[PDB]
Amino acid sequence: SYITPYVPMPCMINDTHFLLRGPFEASWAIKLEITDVTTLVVDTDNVANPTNISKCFANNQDERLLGFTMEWFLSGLEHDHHFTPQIICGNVSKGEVNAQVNITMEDHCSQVFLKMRRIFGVFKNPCTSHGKQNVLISVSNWTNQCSG
Ligand SMILES: *[C@@H]1O[C@H](CO)[C@@H](O)[C@H](O)[C@H]1NC(C)=O
Ligand SMILES: *[C@@H]1O[C@H](CO)[C@@H](O)[C@H](O)[C@H]1NC(C)=O
Numbered sequence: 001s002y003i004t005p006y007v008p009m010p011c012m013i014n015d016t017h018f019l020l021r022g023p024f025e026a027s028w029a030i031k032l033e034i035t036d037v038t039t040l041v042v043d044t045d046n047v048a049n050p051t052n053i054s055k056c057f058a059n060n061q062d063e064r065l066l067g068f069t070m071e072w073f074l075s076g077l078e079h080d081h082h083f084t085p086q087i088i089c090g091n092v093s094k095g096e097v098n099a100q101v102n103i104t105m106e107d108h109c110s111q112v113f114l115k116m117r118r119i120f121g122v123f124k125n126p127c128t129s130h131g132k133q134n135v136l137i138s139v140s141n142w143t144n145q146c147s148g
């Protein structure tokens with residue numbers, strides 16, 4: 001049973017904003033935001049899937065460590081043939097988020113919520129809404145947003 005070293009430090013800000021500080025006290029954190037606002041639309045070459053979501057971080061510094069950390073975050077999810085949310089990569093050079101994960105479908109939403117509750121603890125279930133819903137994934141600077 002393999003124990004990855006690339007485990008981030010979780011930091012829940014509130015029901016919609018979450019941070020995963022990079023392993024080994026990195027100066028960055030992966031930012032997750034639950035929102036019903038859609039910022040990315042599918043074009044001919046920005047679509048990804050859970051297995052290669054790492055490619056949505058190719059233009060980032062520390063790309064390898066970012067991939068290992070996203071691999072940790074999606075454990076149990078990318079292994080699931082039925083976890084098939086639409087994922088779109090954003091243009092980070094134009095200020096867009098790294099990835100937009102479509103969680104409008106209830107089964108996908110709830111699978112993500114259950115994983116996030118396991119990592120962060122209890123928060124408001126976002127899946128009881130109807131209408132479009134997303135998780136936006138980006139990279140923020142770590143400024144000690146959580147401490148003891
Ligand atoms: C959650 O936190 C983010 C930034 O930390 C803020 O933009 C948002 O308004 C907060 N939400 C609530 C319900 O306080
Ligand atoms: C997300 O999925 C829903 C239904 O599956 C769809 O209506 C919506 O257009 C999708 N979002 C994007 C950005 O395509």
Ligand SMILES: *[C@@H]1O[C@H](CO)[C@@H](O)[C@H](O)[C@H]1NC(C)=O
Binds near residue numbers: 049052055
């Ligand atoms: C991820 O893989 C799919 C299918 O293999 C491919 O169509 C898509 O271009 C890949 N995404 C990126 C960002 O390379």
